[PDB]
Structure formats: C-alpha cells, structure tokens
C-alpha cells in the first residue's frame, strides 16, 4: 500500500500555453514493482525516451484522463522500458476511486506506456487494467485536465506534459 519507500514522480502540465500545475504521484513499487519501475523510468527519461512533451490525448469527464502515447502521440502507440509490451503484473489494487494510476491496454498482457488517471471508481476495469499508483498532490490539476475533455474523449486544447521527473 502507500509507503515511504515508494518512488514519487511528477508531471507539470499545460493546456495550450496555460499552466495547469503539478501532479505528484506515488507509485506502488511494493505491489507492482515492474509496472512502477516502467512508469518511473518514463518520468525521468533515463532510457532515452519518456513522457516529457507527450500529451493527454483522450479525456472523458467522470471517467479518465488518458496519456502516455510516447511513440505516435495520438492514442495508437506507446512503448515500455521492457519492449513494445509487457505482462499484467497483478490485479492486487482495485479502481476504487479518483486519482488512481492505471495502465491502458488493448487486451491481456499488452501494457506499454499508455496510462490513465481515474476520475471516478471504475469496477469494470478491475482484473482488466493494472493499478500501479495514486495522485498524492495536485488532484486540482487533474480536474483542470478533465475540464477540457468531452463525452467521446476529444480535448479542446492540447494538453502537454511540459516537464516530468522523479522527486
Ligand atoms: Cl514500515
């Protein structure tokens, strides 16, 4: 669960030139170490690729803010530090409320770099998507991102991760 030894990472987010603030996230390395490590390394950029300058390409109010397509920047791409895809590590954490970080996928064992931040409980994603962290500060920034979304997910401003890293 939450723990002092878990890594902490951040995104600084902008919407068409407007600063939205910083999201700070704790990653459950103690539950899903491979999945947490992937996300952490993508935040620092240490493998030579990562989340910096990527966008939130799909935002559905009352559901998710989705980003992490670092290879195509449109929802069709993504890549992990382990290759194009990696396994669903476990489903020990459920989608019990807002502010959870969960891996996007297109089927079993197809995790890459795409992720969502939840805006609500989502039981239907349990045993389907791996939850690997939570927003510890900056949920206000997440609600700003939500404000630019729409029912089908298109966004009215380009929402970018202008800086990111590990605390
Ligand atoms: Cl302890």
Curated annotation (Swiss-Prot):
<comment type="similarity">
    <text>Belongs to the RanBP2 E3 ligase family.</text>
</comment>
<feature type="repeat" description="20">
    <location>
        <begin position="49"/>
        <end position="50"/>
    </location>
</feature>
<feature type="domain" description="PPIase cyclophilin-type">
    <location>
        <begin position="10"/>
        <end position="166"/>
    </location>
</feature>
<comment type="subunit">
    <text>(Microbial infection) Interacts with HIV-1 Vpu protein; this interaction allows Vpu to down-regulate BLM sumoylation.</text>
</comment>
<feature type="repeat" description="21">
    <location>
        <begin position="132"/>
        <end position="133"/>
    </location>
</feature>
<feature type="modified residue" description="Phosphoserine">
    <location>
        <position position="150"/>
    </location>
</feature>
<comment type="subunit">
    <text>Part of the nuclear pore complex. Forms a complex with NXT1, NXF1 and RANGAP1. Forms a tight complex with RANBP1 and UBE2I. Interacts with SUMO1 but not SUMO2. Interacts with PRKN. Interacts with sumoylated RANGAP1. Interacts with CDCA8. Interacts with PML (isoform PML-4). Interacts with BICD2. Interacts with MCM3AP isoform GANP. Interacts with COX11. Interacts with synaptic plasticity regulator PANTS.</text>
</comment>
<protein>
    <recommendedName>
        <fullName>E3 SUMO-protein ligase RanBP2</fullName>
    </recommendedName>
</protein>
<feature type="repeat" description="22">
    <location>
        <begin position="148"/>
        <end position="149"/>
    </location>
</feature>
<comment type="function">
    <text>E3 SUMO-protein ligase which facilitates SUMO1 and SUMO2 conjugation by UBE2I. Involved in transport factor (Ran-GTP, karyopherin)-mediated protein import via the F-G repeat-containing domain which acts as a docking site for substrates. Binds single-stranded RNA (in vitro). May bind DNA. Component of the nuclear export pathway. Specific docking site for the nuclear export factor exportin-1. Inhibits EIF4E-dependent mRNA export. Sumoylates PML at 'Lys-490' which is essential for the proper assembly of PML-NB.</text>
</comment>
